[PDB]
Amino acid sequence: FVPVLWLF
Amino acid sequence: PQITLWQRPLVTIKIGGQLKEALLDTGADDTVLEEMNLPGRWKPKMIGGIGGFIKVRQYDQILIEICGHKAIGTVLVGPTPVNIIGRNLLTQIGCTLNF
Amino acid sequence: PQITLWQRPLVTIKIGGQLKEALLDTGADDTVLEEMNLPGRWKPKMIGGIGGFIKVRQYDQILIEICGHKAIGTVLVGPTPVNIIGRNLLTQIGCTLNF
Ligand SMILES: [Mg+2]
């Protein structure tokens, strides 16, 4: 979950 | 406030009188918010992620209130699953990291 | 230290004897690092991004130094465009958000 990489 | 990081740093924000939940994100240059109706004009923009880009609408000079702090700044509106408060607004409220 | 957000909060990290730069990201649950030769056991993991999935290697119980502070936790290694230190390690160095 890394919003700035668009990974959730 | 002082916020520990054992949980997601989710806060309530006020934007156009509406209350929404958002994540204080020191890693984000920009503030990115879920689909909503902001008034006035916008500019088309692209934000990169893993394996591609997301289309968003950039609105300038938007008032956002966060834990009593009133920030005015640029927001990107798009199909983000989570509202992200980025450094452009975090600096306006005096936010620092400390360890 | 106190890290301000006028610039990206990029700091020096050391992992597997190598120095790199990484972003302190309060919005990230997890820590994701660029491809890298790291010794030891790992587990394969998949993550769904915009255009598709990426495969990464999950390393648990890894020692990492972040801006001088030693921390132990999980790191994911793969094709990320930026090194991200997430909350799983930020808590371990005693990092707080303050405004
Ligand atoms: Mg440093």
- Helix/strand/coil for B88: helix
Structure tokens at C92: 């371990």
- Helix/strand/coil for C35: coil
Resolution in Å, one decimal place: 2.0
Of chain C residues 42-71, which have a CB less than 8 A from chain B? 47, 49-52, 54, 67, 69
Cβ of C18: how many Cβ atoms within 10 Å?
10
Elucidation technique: X-ray
Question: Taking CB atoms and an 8 Å limit, are A7 and C25 in contact across chains?
Answer: no
Which residues, other chains included, contact C41 with Cβ-Cβ below 8 Å and sequence gap of 6+?
Answer: C59
Relative to beta strand B52-66, strand B43-49 is antiparallel
The answer to whether C24 faces chain B, any CB pair under 8 Å, is yes
User: In angstroms, rounded to a whole number, what is the distance separating the alpha carbons of residues B43 and B45?
Assistant: 6
* CB distance C24 to B9 below 8 Å: no
* DSSP for B9-23, written as a single string: -EEEEEETTEEEEEE
What is the CA angle A3-B80-C28, rounded to 5? 15
